[PDB]
Nucleic acid binder design. Structure first.
Ligand code: MG
Ligand code: ZN
Lengths: 329, 697, 21, 296, 82, 90, 56, 225, 235
RNA sequence: AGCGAG
């Protein structure tokens, strides 16, 4: 309302200012009830999906791991600590030994990677490190203690019976009811975990090429002519309301070289397409990043490993294309 | 209380037969619409899953013959405000450019300024076409209801806190005494009068004879009329409904004059709580997170105390074996617990009874059954007989106590209408004087609720330099962020009203008191005052009245112009290093007393189709251990406690008596079995033609 | 207004045209 | 204390009555089980001491619906209180999200040996300090206690009893020989608790820089003495933390207190964390009472 | 460097965890020992059975679980995991 | 909201168990023949009560002797000595 | 969720539940296979150490 | 060293309110001593008060007597403001009989020997032509506040109406210390204890009784030696 | 009215001069009444002695450093200010601390005149350097409490004479804690716990006993007002 | 149905 309420609560609001004020307060009190309901339902779903994720072994010895960026190299040359590092790299186990300028090991595999470890890594001048995560856990039933990493509550390595799935579900779903609901709050997390096609279905490139962009009426065409030179694909009646994305500083410019995933239109990209285009690892990264972005936007900190547990539970099945000859539809 | 009944009337519920249901009701009907102004309160509304579906009719609102809600407005003609009050419905208001109540008038009927604030058809409050506005609000507070019109300094409270204060004024219990607030509004008296729980003389006359049970008044012409008070009657919610006269034996009383105040009324004006000397400091972590610490004076002088009357009903019926008798011959029970019971059964009036005592001695027939060999041997050894009649006596349910006000006995033999197949029906009224104790819920009128964490002795209570201990201590951490600064304002004004003031008009009136109404420049100590909802005591006027606060007994102002007093520590003895905001806050005792909230269980009734004992304090109820709690237990990794809970504490009907035996005999708690609910589920599935079988391996 | 009432003095600066219904 | 919860006498007697009947039969206050049940149902004066003997070190789980996370069920060692209300520790409030404006809560009683062991070890409230979600402490002081500690440890220049190095006419006349002398001066209207001074400290470990300068290698602080240019309030606060923790000497914002508790949990055992947290709560409440924060 | 642990928090759980592999192992260890001690106290006045204990001077009114834990603290027991 | 009024109440169950235990003990106090006669009179041993004639037949004694010893047994068990160990159960 | 659909399909498929998760074990009232209920902690064998038995 | 012991002096202002000046104290001792005296006075001064009343034509405090303008509960409240001083520990019974129109005050009550009503003008009830009020009150000695003893516990009939008893005869106690604080550091404290009692005992006697109790207690801290 | 419970005072000993007295069960609220009294009394009633001024030769205008010692003026002051001294004299008595030669100057190196005893004979006051000589004149009085340093009003009096804060009180730090015992069976009686730390001049228990005496005096004045008056007597 | 806590 552009009036506005031009008075303080010490000065005392006039009659009309108080009436105008009451609208938002009543709206918030109804929204809070509906939001607690939605968050409870989401927590129930998250608990039920990941019941069977509990620590079973101590170690897989799996080589597979996930890369975490830590600080970012400054253009002038310097390592500035990544802002969201406390929830990404801390309380994780190194999968591969760290190497500084092709030198000795600052910290080898199988370390809790606590605050002194991060300090040492930033001092050395190394940014990307491979840690062990539940996503790349070789054990079949549940996960293992080392790949899961440190228990946040206990502060040490997780036990061999911890129901990390329930803890992850509760940790993700408790800060809901404080997430003030493209979709950007609790609905966004709900449609991210449900893997639903988003409302703002912003298509992403399929093959590296040049974006032959047009200006249409009631639509656009983000065409792309590849560098594979193969069979350039075009995009459908991409609506005019959706504004173009800011690709790296320069917005998407007609005839511009894009990579395999660079989001072309503003908003979200449905996880299924990015999965089909970039394999399971990139969809994992996309899901964790989007959920953590939603939770950070309000000011809530959840460690990445819980969202990783849920994401792991989401990517465990395969569609059958060819039966072969074994009872597979 | 009278306010709760009054606001149950004037309540508009958007749900019921042929109306929106909470589930099917969307989110756009719960919001506030611009058309609600003057027709429905935007503040007073339930805070649960009913916000917006239930509201309260505004003070001046009226109902069109067609069912629409009209609101009054002053017809302003040619820029000239008038007195003609037209009642407009929402439609007609939209077509007219309606002004606002607090628009200064030049005393000629005309607006003394251009740019007069206004509303328009679309509900948009915006800039204004000066002159040629067709209507004006009748008065401020037109948009608030009766409950919200009794919150002083409402304009200084956020809508959430005002809403909670409005909803919490209706929960105040009737205290024994009741005191009219020092700081109130103009709605107190009218609310009490129109609530109907306060006696008003029908016609003028001279009080002929007044006593504690009736008032006989001689009218101006011969005839005389007797109003009969309602002494210590029980309300629907268990509170007291005492009425006492407030007129002498010779006073002349005019028609419509209050002559006997009701439960929550003082001299005819509503009084829901008590004025308490309050400090707004944090104190030793006992008033932590909206908790309240009260002096023991409030329990000694008995100022926060409520009479609660509870009715117990028992009816002797006609059964197959015969009929139930009400007499003092209860089987097998001794001559001690048959002591108070009258010659005819039911307990005597004025007999103190504690939980478990017998109120009505009833005895229903049992019919022949099979006494066990052990019990037959014991009866022979102790020489008794089965009596063939069981007991079904009425007893003071668990956790209750009190005197016995009166017994009401209905009987068929005396030809009193009773349901079919019942011979007698006796109701016993048990009254207890509840004193405020920790766990009880208190609140002011500004949504500043809280349970009582502690009740300090008066000696370890902060006391002003004069020596007066403070009665209550609220926390300063709850004011700034909940945005209900109004309470602080009230506090300051309360103190001023308690002390009295004199504006020093030696050389004219002070600039801050120029617009003060006459005769407010001087107020004697303990002077009741009113600050109407949206016109009231401006902050400058409050500052001024706080500066002049004529001294208590000697020349000593205990509260500086800032409103803060230098308090002495009750325990240490040293003064607190900095002044403390001290005043008089009018706080109510909400009807959420801990005596009705406490509950415990070790074993009791079990539900019919399933075990998992009945829920509810009314029964002997176990506390629900839901799925969220079970997930929390699973996350802890505590498998054994969860299995114990869900098997032997709740459902397993064989391991239950076994765990009781083990506990009583010192043995180990036994292994739990299959919960009964699982076998119930298996039978339900099978009866759905689903062959479910539990394969051994 | 009401014949016999406590004398509660008001800080009200605006006269009310309509008595409460 | 962080591992305790008040339990109303009536509620405890009803919850434990299977146990109290046994105990008051064994003590011979009752002849048999039915007589004992009768005494319990009439709450005879002698069945309260037996109750205190039964309830001893027998944990009870406390729950507040909704249980949005794991730390919404926590086991406490129950203590008997006078009337009808469960006395909750202030620190576990944020874990339960429980403020005292009518927030009822439920009490469950573990029975078997495994249940008692789980309640005592896994769920004990003093064992659950850090949030399982992010690891940040959940039992750290908040609201009144943070205000008290911030008021205590904040420094105000120009305060009474401050330190002035002026020479030519008199010495610095601001230095104190021990915290005992500092507190004695505080009792007199001389030294404020928030005044920069220099004091001789001999029981609190100095920070890393001054330790590495004056000691260097193996500074054994329990006996050695050093000069701390700080306020008295910071000394009093640093006396609450364990002996090994070096001097902080910082105004204690919420973030700083949370970081201190994080570091303490990471380095020290969780019992030390619980005791330090409890002492912090006590000091915070005391100095929140003394802070004089109020609204007008 | 603690101070006298009082009540249910005695002995400290950390210095018990030093005796086992995890909190769950400690839970089962103490629970089974407590069951053994209760069985001893019950089935001893009757024909002498086998389960032994306590190994530490019990308090005048002290529950079997606390005795079991005080035994664990003194490294007075042994256990084998499945 | 309806209570099963025919469920093992779990307190009368333990009460009955202890009643049977203490009754068995106090019976073991008196002479063996006395115990036998009262037992088989009320059918405590196996739940089948019989009259004087049956017990007389099984022990090969006339009905009247069983009646007499039964009277003596009741008189003994009624003594205050063996009643305070059995009251509070009736 | 969707109890009727789930049970219809399970009945048609002759699906056997191995009772291995946490919800199934909770439903049938037996120890959940997590935390203290797993097979390595549940059947810990506890006995006095030999020196303690000798002392006592 | 101070080299001077303390002394006390009374300043009788009213027959109830008086200033006790104690000087010279030690720097800092003023507030501590004054608060100790106040906490003893306000809580632990023995006195007497009505412990249970019985009206002839009443069965409990939730009824009304015919002819009185006040309820039974209102009568209880009016009697709560009664100040009486007794001289013997054992329970004493006094009577209050009035008939016909009139203002039933405390002065109507007839106190036996030893017990005395120090506010005869206090109002208890107002009667009319049809009213008769006959109530017997019980007074005993004690200290502090004791909740109304229940009827069943102590052998009693269905007529007794237990009343809460507030035995302490002290209204208001404050204290103001006047420190000297000279730069030569020969400072001292002077405590001015204002004490106001409710006409049952002069402030002097209340202060003396507080002295008795506190001396007894601190004697224990002395006997350790 | 004859209190029904007898208070009992016991003590635990932690170090040479440091103790934890416990008084229980006090009536429902007598913990604080006398806990604060005993704190403020134990710390300022017990007659003690302390150095009230010092004179360091060569320190007359600049009070920064002394030639012939490592420690500066402040550290000599602080070390001296923590010197436990018992003076049975009446008026101020001066003392002389003279040491020339490389080595550490301890309290035992002072010459106590008759009437004064130094119960800390092994503390470090200073360390001489460069064949220096330390010739300090102390002034010991006796008082009660932490009298802050008195400024030398007279200019010519002794420009060298450094007024030093005087910890006359023999007790150094006392802290009381009133816990509540027996909520139900006793109606929440309270026990008070006094943690006492005192310098070597006097043992904590004797400090407490002298406290008890001096408190008896004041409340005995109160009693003297009316000797025969009802009072809750421990019996 | 009204109502409380979140
Ligand atoms: Mg709440
Ligand atoms: Zn792994």
């Amino acid at each position: 309302i552009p009036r506005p309420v031009k008075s303080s609560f010490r000065e005392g609001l006039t009659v009309l200012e108080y009436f105008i004020n009451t609208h938002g307060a009543r709206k918030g009190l109804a929204d809070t009830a509906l939001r607690t309901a939605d968050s409870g339902y989401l927590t129930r779903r998250l608990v039920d999906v990941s019941q069977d994720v509990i620590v079973r072994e101590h170690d897989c010895q799996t080589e597979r791991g996930i890369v975490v960026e830590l600080a970012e190299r400054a253009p002038d040359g310097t390592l500035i600590r990544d802002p969201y590092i406390e929830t990404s790299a801390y309380a994780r186990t190194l999968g591969t030994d760290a190497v500084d300028e092709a030198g000795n090991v600052i910290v080898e595999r199988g370390q809790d990677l606590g605050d002194p470890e991060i300090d040492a890594l930033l001092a050395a001048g190394i940014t990307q490190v491979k840690v062990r995560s539940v996503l790349t856990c070789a054990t079949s039933t549940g996960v293992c203690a080392t790949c899961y990493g440190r228990s946040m509550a206990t502060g040490k390595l997780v036990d061999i019976g911890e129901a990390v799935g329930i803890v992850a579900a509760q940790s993700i779903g408790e800060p809901g009811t404080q997430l003030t609901m493209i979709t950007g709050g609790l609905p966004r997390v709900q449609e991210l975990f449900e893997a639903r096609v988003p409302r703002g279905k912003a298509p992403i490139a399929d093959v590296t090429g040049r974006v032959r962009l047009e200006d249409g009426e009631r639509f656009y065409k983000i065409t792309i002519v590849p560098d594979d030179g193969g069979e350039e694909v075009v995009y459908d009646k991409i609506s005019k309301r959706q504004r173009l994305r800011v690709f790296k500083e320069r917005v998407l410019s007609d005839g511009d070289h894009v990579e395999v995933g660079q989001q072309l239109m503003e908003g979200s990209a449905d996880p299924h397409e990015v999965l089909r285009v970039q394999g399971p690892r990139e969809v994992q990264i996309h899901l964790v990043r989007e959920v953590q972005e939603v939770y950070r936007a309000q000011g809530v900190s959840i460690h990445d490993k819980h969202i990783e547990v849920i994401v792991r539970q989401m990517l465990r099945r395969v569609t059958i294309i060819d039966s072969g000859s074994t009872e597979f539809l | 209380n009278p306010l709760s009944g009054l606001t149950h009337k004037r309540r508009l519920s958007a749900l019921g037969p042929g109306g929106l249901s909470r589930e099917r009701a969307g989110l756009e009907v719960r919001d506030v619409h611009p058309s609600h102004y003057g027709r429905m309160c935007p503040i007073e509304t339930p805070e649960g899953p009913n916000i917006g579906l239930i509201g309260s009719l505004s003070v001046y609102a009226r109902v069109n013959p067609f069912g629409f809600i009209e609101t009054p407005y002053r017809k302003v003609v040619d820029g000239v405000v008038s007195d003609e009050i037209v009642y407009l419905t929402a439609d007609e208001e939209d077509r007219h450019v309606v002004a606002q109540a607090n628009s200064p008038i030049d005393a000629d009927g005309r607006f003394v300024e251009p740019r007069v604030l206004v509303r328009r058809k679309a509900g948009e409050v915006e800039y204004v076409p000066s002159s040629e506005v067709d209507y004006m609000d009748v008065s401020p507070r037109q948009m608030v209801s009766v409950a919200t019109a009794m919150i002083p300094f409402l304009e200084h409270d956020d809508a959430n806190r005002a809403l909670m204060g409005a909803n919490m004024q209706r929960q105040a219990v009737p205290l024994v005494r009741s005191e009219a607030p020092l700081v109130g509004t103009g709605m107190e008296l009218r609310a009490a009068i129109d609530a109907g729980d306060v006696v008003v003389a029908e016609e003028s006359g001279v009080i002929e004879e007044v006593s504690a049970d009736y008032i006989t008044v001689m009218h101006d012409n011969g005839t005389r009329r007797t109003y009969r008070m309602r002494k210590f009657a029980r309300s629907n919610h268990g509170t007291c409904a005492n009425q006492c006269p407030i007129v002498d034996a010779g006073d002349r009383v005019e028609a419509g004059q209050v002559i006997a105040d009701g439960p929550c009324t003082d001299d005819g004006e509503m009084a829901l709580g008590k004025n308490l000397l309050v400090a707004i400091m944090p104190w030793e972590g006992h008033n932590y997170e909206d908790a309240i610490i009260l002096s023991n004076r409030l329990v000694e002088e008995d100022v926060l105390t409520s009479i609660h009357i509870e009715e117990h009903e028992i009816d002797a019926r006609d059964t197959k074996l015969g009929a139930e008798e009400i007499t003092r011959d209860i089987p097998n029970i001794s001559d001690e617990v048959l002591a108070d019971l009258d010659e005819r059964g039911i307990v005597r009036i004025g007999a103190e009874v504690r939980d478990g005592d017998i109120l009505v001695g009833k005895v229903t027939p049992k019919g022949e059954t099979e006494l066990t060999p052990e019990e037959r041997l014991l009866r022979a050894i102790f020489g008794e007989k089965a009596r063939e009649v069981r007991d079904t006596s009425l007893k003071v349910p668990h956790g209750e106590s009190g005197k016995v006000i009166g017994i009401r006995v209905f009987s068929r033999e005396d030809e009193d209408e009773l349901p079919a197949g019942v011979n007698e029906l006796v109701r016993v009224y048990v009254a207890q004087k509840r004193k405020i104790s920790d766990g009880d819920k208190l609140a002011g009128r500004h949504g500043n609720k809280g349970v009582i964490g502690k009740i300090l002795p008066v000696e370890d209570m902060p006391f002003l330099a004069d020596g007066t201990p403070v009665d209550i201590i609220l926390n300063t951490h709850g004011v700034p962020r909940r945005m209900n600064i109004g309470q602080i304002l009230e506090t300051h004004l309360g103190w001023c009203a308690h002390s009295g003031w004199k504006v020093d008009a030696a050389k004219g009136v002070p600039d801050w008191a120029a617009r003060l109404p006459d005769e407010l420049l001087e107020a004697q100590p303990n002077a009741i005052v009113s600050t109407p909802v949206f016109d009231g005591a401006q902050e400058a006027e409050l500052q001024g009245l706080l500066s002049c606060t004529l001294p208590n007994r000697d020349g000593d102002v205990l509260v500086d112009a800032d409103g803060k007093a230098m308090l002495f520590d009750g325990r240490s003895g040293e003064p607190f290093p900095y002044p403390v905001t001290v005043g008089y806050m009018y706080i109510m005792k909400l009807h959420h007393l801990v005596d009705d909230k406490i509950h415990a269980r070790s074993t009791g009734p079990y539900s019919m189709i399933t075990q998992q004992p009945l829920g509810g304090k009314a029964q002997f109820g176990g506390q629900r251990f839901g799925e969220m709690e079970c997930w929390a237990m699973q996350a802890y990794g505590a498998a054994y406690t969860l299995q114990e809970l869900l098997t032997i504490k709740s459902d397993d009907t064989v391991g239950r008596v076994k765990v009781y035996e083990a506990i009583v005999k010192g043995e180990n708690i036994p292994e739990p079995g299959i919960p009964e609910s699982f076998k119930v589920l298996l039978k339900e599935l099978q009866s759905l033609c689903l062959n479910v079988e539990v394969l051994s391996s | 207004s009401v014949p016999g009432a406590p004398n509660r003095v008001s800080f009200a600066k605006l006269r009310e045209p309509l008595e409460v219904p | 204390k962080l591992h305790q919860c008040g339990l109303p006498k009536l509620m405890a007697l009803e919850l434990f009555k299977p146990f109290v009947m046994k105990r008051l039969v064994d003590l011979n206050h009752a002849q048999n089980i039915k007589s004992a049940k009768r005494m319990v149902e009439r709450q005879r004066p002698q069945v309260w001491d037996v109750l205190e003997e039964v309830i001893a070190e027998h944990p009870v789980l406390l729950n507040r619906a909704p249980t949005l996370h794991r730390l919404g069920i926590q086991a406490f060692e129950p203590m008997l209180v006078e009337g009808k209300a469960i006395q909750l520790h202030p620190l576990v409030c944020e874990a339960f999200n429980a403020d005292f404006d009518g927030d009822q809560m439920a009490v469950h009683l573990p029975l078997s040996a495994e249940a008692q062991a789980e309640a005592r070890i896994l769920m004990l409230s003093s064992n659950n300090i850090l949030s399982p979600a992010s690891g940040r402490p959940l039992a750290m002081p908040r609201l009144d206690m943070v205000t008290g500690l911030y008021y205590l440890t904040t420094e105000v220049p120009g305060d009474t009893g401050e330190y002035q190095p002026a020479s030519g006419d008199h010495p610095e006349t601001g230095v104190y020989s021990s915290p005992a002398e500092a507190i004695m001066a505080a009792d007199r209207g001389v030294l404020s608790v928030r005044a920069k001074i220099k004091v001789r400290l001999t029981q609190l470990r100095p920070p890393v820089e001054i330790e590495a300068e004056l000691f260097g290698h193996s500074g054994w602080q329990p006996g050695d003495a050093w000069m701390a240019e700080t306020t008295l309030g910071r000394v009093m606060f640093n006396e609450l933390l364990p002996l090994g923790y070096p001097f902080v000497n910082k105004q204690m914002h919420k973030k700083v207190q949370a970081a201190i508790i994080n570091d303490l949990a990471e380095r020290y055992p969780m019992i030390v964390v619980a005791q330090t947290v409890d002492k912090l709560k006590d000091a915070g409440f005391y100095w929140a009472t003394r802070s004089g924060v109020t609204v007008s | 460097g603690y101070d006298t642990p009082l009540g249910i928090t005695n002995p400290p759980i950390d210095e018990l965890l030093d005796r086992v592999s995890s909190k769950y192992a400690l839970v089962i260890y103490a629970a089974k020992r407590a069951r053994q001690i209760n069985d001893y106290y019950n089935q001893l006045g009757e024909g002498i059975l086998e389960y032994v204990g306590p190994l530490v001077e019990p308090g005048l009114q002290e529950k079997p679980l606390s005795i079991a834990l005080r035994e664990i603290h003194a490294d007075l027991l042994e256990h084998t995991e499945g | 909201f309806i209570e099963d009024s025919e469920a093992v109440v779990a307190v009368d169950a333990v009460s009955f168990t202890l009643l049977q235990d203490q009754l068995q003990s106090v019976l073991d106090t008196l002479s063996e023949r006395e115990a036998g006669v009262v037992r088989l009179r009320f059918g405590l041993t196996d739940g089948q009560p019989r009259t004087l004639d049956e017990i007389g037949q099984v022990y090969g004694v006339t009905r009247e002797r069983i009646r007499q010893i039964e009277s003596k047994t009741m008189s003994k068990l009624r003594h205050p000595s063996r009643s305070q160990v059995l009251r509070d159960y009736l | 969720q969707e109890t009727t659909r789930v049970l219809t399909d399970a009945a048609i498929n002759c699906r056997s539940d191995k009772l291995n998760g946490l919800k199934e074990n909770v439903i049938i009232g037996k120890l959940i296979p997590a935390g203290t209920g797993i097979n390595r902690y549940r059947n810990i064998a506890v006995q006095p150490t030999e020196e303690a038995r000798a002392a006592a | 060293l101070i080299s001077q012991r303390p002394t006390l002096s009374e300043d009788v202002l009213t027959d109830n309110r008086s200033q006790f000046v104690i000087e010279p104290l030690e720097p800092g001792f003023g507030y501590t001593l004054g608060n100790s005296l106040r906490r003893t006075l306000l809580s632990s001064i023995p006195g007497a008060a009505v412990t249970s009343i019985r009206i002839d034509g009443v069965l409990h405090e939730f009824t009304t007597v015919p002819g009185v303008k006040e309820d039974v509960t209102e009568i209880i409240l009016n009697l709560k403001s009664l100040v009486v001083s007794s001289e013997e520990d054992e329970p004493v019974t006094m009577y209050l009989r009035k008939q016909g129109p009139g203002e039933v005050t405390a002065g109507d009550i007839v106190p036996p020997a030893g017990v005395t009503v120090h506010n005869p003008g206090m109002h208890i009830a107002t009667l009319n032509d049809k009213g008769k009020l006959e109530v017997e009150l019980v007074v005993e000695r004690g200290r502090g506040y004791v909740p109304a003893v229940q009827n069943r516990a102590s052998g009693a009939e269905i007529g007794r109406i237990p009343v809460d008893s507030i035995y302490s005869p002290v209204l208001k106690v404050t204290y103001k210390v006047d420190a000297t604080r000279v730069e030569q550091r020969t400072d001292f404290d002077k405590l001015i204890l204002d004490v106001e009692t409710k006409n049952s005992i002069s402030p002097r006697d209340a202060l003396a009784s507080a002295g008795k109790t506190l001396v007894e207690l601190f004697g224990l801290a002395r006997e350790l030696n």
